[PDB]
């Protein structure tokens, strides 16, 4: 019975790594989105630009942050997610007695990376201030994805040991 019970631990571990794969696939887009917003803030930092180019870069930033929030909210598998922030964490089976393999959720939504839905820039100085906060959001996002990937490698190692 102890041997036959481990198949549930294995299929739960596989569902967990699949959810990790979906969250990482969404983060791969969220990082490029943050990078392009950083470039737009750096381009909008100029004092030499005419107003029209400034509103153009601002419109790119609006569309970019909206696309980031959408890609963050689309990241879910089998009704659950580790990127939208709907739950603090998800547990999966790790042993036949009911021990759990905790995997902390790492929010990738706009509020989870320090950005507000309304956040923009209105003048050159506001874009210059925006540069540093966008860099901090990119840094925290990469740290969250690094934690998710380490959790995925641990999930794979535990699956192999459970098979042994």
């Amino acid at each position: 019975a102890t041997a036959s019970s481990l198949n549930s631990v294995k299929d739960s571990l596989q569902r967990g790594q699949s959810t990790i794969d979906v969250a990482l696939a969404a983060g791969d887009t969220i990082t490029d989105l943050l990078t392009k917003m950083k470039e737009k803030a750096l381009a909008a930092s100029d004092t030499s630009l005419n107003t029209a180019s400034f509103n153009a870069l601002k419109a790119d930033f609006e569309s970019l942050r909206d696309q980031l929030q959408k890609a963050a909210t689309n990241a879910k598998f089998n009704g659950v997610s580790l990127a939208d922030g709907s739950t603090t964490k998800l547990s999966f089976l790790a042993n036949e007695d009911g021990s759990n393999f905790t995997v902390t959720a790492q929010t990738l939504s706009l509020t989870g990376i320090g950005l507000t839905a309304t956040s923009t820039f209105t003048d050159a100085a506001t874009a210059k201030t925006m540069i540093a906060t966008i860099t901090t959001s990119l840094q925290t996002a990469t740290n969250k994805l690094s934690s998710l990937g380490t959790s995925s490698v641990g999930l794979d190692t535990h699956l192999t040991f459970v098979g042994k």
Binding site: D11, Q14, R15, S18, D21, V22, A25, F77, N78
Partner: protein, 52 residues
């Protein structure tokens, strides 16, 4: 995204055929041994005729 969902359904569903081949061959060997054991069990009564 659709690629990830297809891979996840494959993880949830697909069998490991390399273990199924061994399961199959050991089960065939057990079936032949069991048919021979059934033949031996059918031949067990036969000694009664020697008594008369």
């Amino acid at each position: 995204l659709q690629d990830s969902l297809d891979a996840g359904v494959g993880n949830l569903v697909d069998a490991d055929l390399a273990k199924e081949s061994a399961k199959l061959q050991s089960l065939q060997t057990k079936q032949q041994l069991g048919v021979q054991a059934l033949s031996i069990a059918n031949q067990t009564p036969q000694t009664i005729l020697s008594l008369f």
